[PDB]
């Protein structure tokens, strides 16, 4: 598994955390995004996470450590639940559908305020049955390409 396409997406995903663009993710840059997503880890837990992915034990996470992890965790079974936990982050009402607003919400929380247009397209970017929404089936199909 692992096609340059997927790797390249994981790099841009990595960048989302490495906001300052130095090539490493800090315990600080991690907390910021997790709290943006409604996750509430304690400072000591933040270092745990950083320490788990940090293979060179140098204090932070570089893309390689990020790729190393995601590539492994992806091809696994736990993904089942994890991918689903990823859905909930978006589906706040747990109605089984990620509506336009919900997607807006998360983005604005990530400090990314977009017009209602680019948001509706950011959806049809995976809306199999064109219902202007992303269900679980379409969400999981979008994670595993």
């Amino acid at each position: 598994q692992l096609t340059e396409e997927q790797i390249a997406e994981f790099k841009e995903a990595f960048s989302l955390f490495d906001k300052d663009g130095d090539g490493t993710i800090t315990t600080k840059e991690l907390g910021t995004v997790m709290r943006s997503l409604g996750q509430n880890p304690t400072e000591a837990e933040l270092q745990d996470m950083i320490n788990e992915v940090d293979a060179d034990g140098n204090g932070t996470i570089d893309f390689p450590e990020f790729l190393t992890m995601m590539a492994r965790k992806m091809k696994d079974t736990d993904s089942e639940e994890e991918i689903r936990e990823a859905f909930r982050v978006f589906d706040k009402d747990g109605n089984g559908y990620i509506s336009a607003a919900e997607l807006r919400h998360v983005m604005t929380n990530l400090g990314e305020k977009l017009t209602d247009e680019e948001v509706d397209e950011m959806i049809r970017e995976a809306d199999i049955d064109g219902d202007g929404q992303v269900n679980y089936e379409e969400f999981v199909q979008m994670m595993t390409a």
């Binding site: 841009e12 995903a13 997503l37 304690t42 837990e45 745990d48 996470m49 990823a86 680019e118």
Partner: protein, 189 residues
């Protein structure tokens, strides 16, 4: 400007894979509630929000709780009102029958209790006091003293007061790293 959904999704999958692990390594906490008009359940899920800042809380109605569990708990929290004459709410009689039948407990876990009541009645928060007194007898260590939210004199205020104090104590007996710096909700100031 912007991040393709397929990318963002991979990033949030990264965070989720991390929270899952630190969460399963936190200490489990069981929050039991019994309620007739729903005020105990609301406070119960509020207790869960506050406890989510350091622990792995679970909110569970008294009638869906299997006593067997008492033998594996680390910390049991109870939020229930009282009725009739020291009577339990509807969804609390099943557990009531049990807890008072139970003569022994090997796992001397930690527990704290908070009951909703109303000063008007002579048997104030009697059901909450009933389970609270029963647990000490059984051997469990009272984390914090039983609280009482008087329907007439600021229930929430009392709850929140007890919620926060019971939490700062839990972060203590369980050795919670960064104890004094955990950012809790805004309502508990």
């Amino acid at each position: 400007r912007e991040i393709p959904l397929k990318v963002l999704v991979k990033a949030v999958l990264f965070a989720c894979m991390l929270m899952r692990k630190t969460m399963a390594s936190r200490v489990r906490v069981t929050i039991l509630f019994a309620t007739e008009t729903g005020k105990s359940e609301a406070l119960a899920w509020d207790l869960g929000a506050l406890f989510s800042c350091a622990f792995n809380p679970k909110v569970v109605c008294m009638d869906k709780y299997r006593l067997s569990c008492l033998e594996e708990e680390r910390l049991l929290l109870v939020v229930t009102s009282t009725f009739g004459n020291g009577d339990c709410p509807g969804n609390g009689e099943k557990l009531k029958k049990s807890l008072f039948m139970l003569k022994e407990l090997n796992n001397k876990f930690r527990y704290a209790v908070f009951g909703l009541g109303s000063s008007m009645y002579p048997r104030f928060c009697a059901f909450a006091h009933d389970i609270d007194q029963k647990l000490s007898h059984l051997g469990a260590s009272q984390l914090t003293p039983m609280g009482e939210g008087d329907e007439l004199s600021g229930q929430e205020d009392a709850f929140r007061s007890w919620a926060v104090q019971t939490f700062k104590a839990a972060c203590e007996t369980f050795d919670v790293r960064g104890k004094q710096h955990i950012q809790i909700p805004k309502l508990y100031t």
